[PDB]
Amino acid sequence: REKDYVVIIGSANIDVAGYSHESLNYADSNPGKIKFTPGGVGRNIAQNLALLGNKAWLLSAVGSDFYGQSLLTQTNQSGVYVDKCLIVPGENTSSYLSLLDNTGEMLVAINDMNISNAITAEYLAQHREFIQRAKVIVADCNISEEALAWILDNAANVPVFVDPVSAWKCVKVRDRLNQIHTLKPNRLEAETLSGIALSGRDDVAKVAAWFHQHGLNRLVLSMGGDGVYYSDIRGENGWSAPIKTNVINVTGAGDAMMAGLASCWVDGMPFAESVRFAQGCSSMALSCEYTNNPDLSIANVISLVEN
């Protein structure tokens, strides 16, 4: 419907990748290739939702600098309503700086995302009504614990899909699983939240049971090569095997899978078929050079799912 919209609350970075032609010399500038790229879990998801054809609003933070503005403009071009983002007066627009090499092997990476704290409970309270009238809310764990707590406490029965981002950033949700509609952790993040070791496929049953005891409505557990384990507090659980994917750039896989899950839910699709669709979406970001695959569409993922 034409007034169904999805609200995404997370971070937006500029992803600076540079590699050296030939070999690192440390004797100043080594001529190579450098790429500026839009990124950040929240912003990445917002874009993938737009590409799947939802009206997606980004609630996020960028700096008063230029390039900050450029990130917003670029995202607008991809379909994302950026109208409501904070433009923080004179702060560094967040960015992830990595130093791949001629192999494509990430060597070392810096990470400057303190502007995430600008995304405050008081900033979000200014959009209470607008947030509470979305079909679904997607939140990443880059934002503060007070911000995420504000969201979960003011969702007004809108389902909140939560992206745990990393082992360190995910602990935020441990005490509020009973407010999260769908949580999408990988193996280490599920180990970190539950305190239960995830040695293999044999261990997911007890990890999921732990999650449901603590209130989690839905679990979507990525176990890498083992595929994806999904579990509903009402009883439905299963495994869905990974899609054979020609892996080009592993970044943006989880951002596509979150988008796929929220989009299918808004669409009316049942849980398991939603997990398979989202696996397809992720498979599409994976075989793309970029963090967000510009060909991600409903028609293109549906064809991937059968083939």
Residue numbers in the entry: 2 to 308
Q: Which lines from the publication concern this structure?
A:
To unveil the catalytic mechanism of EcPsuK for the pseudouridine substrate, we first obtained the crystal structure of apo-EcPsuK; the crystal of apo-EcPsuK was determined at 2.3Å which belonged to the space group P6322. There is one EcPsuK molecule in the asymmetric unit, which can be modeled from Arg2 to Asn308 and folded into a conformation employing the β-α unit as a basic structural motif composed of a central α/β region, and a β-stranded region protruding from the N-terminal. Furthermore, two β-strands β2 and β3 between the β1–α1, β7, and β8 between the β6–α3 extend from the central α/β structure region. These two consecutive β-strands are corporately constituting the antiparallel β-sheet in an edge-to-edge orientation (hereafter named β-thumb region). Therefore, although there is only one EcPsuK molecule in the asymmetric unit, it is a homodimer. Dimerization of EcPsuK is mainly assembled by two regions including the β-thumb region and α2 on the edge of the central β-sheet. The dimer interface adopts a face-to-face mode that looks like a butterfly with the four β-strands in the β-thumb region almost perpendicular to these elements from the adjacent asymmetric unit, which created a cross β-barrel-like fold. In detail, the β-thumb region of each monomer of the EcPsuK homodimer rigidly contacts with each other through many hydrophobic interactions, creating a hydrophobic core. Taken together, these interactions anchored the EcPsuK homodimer.
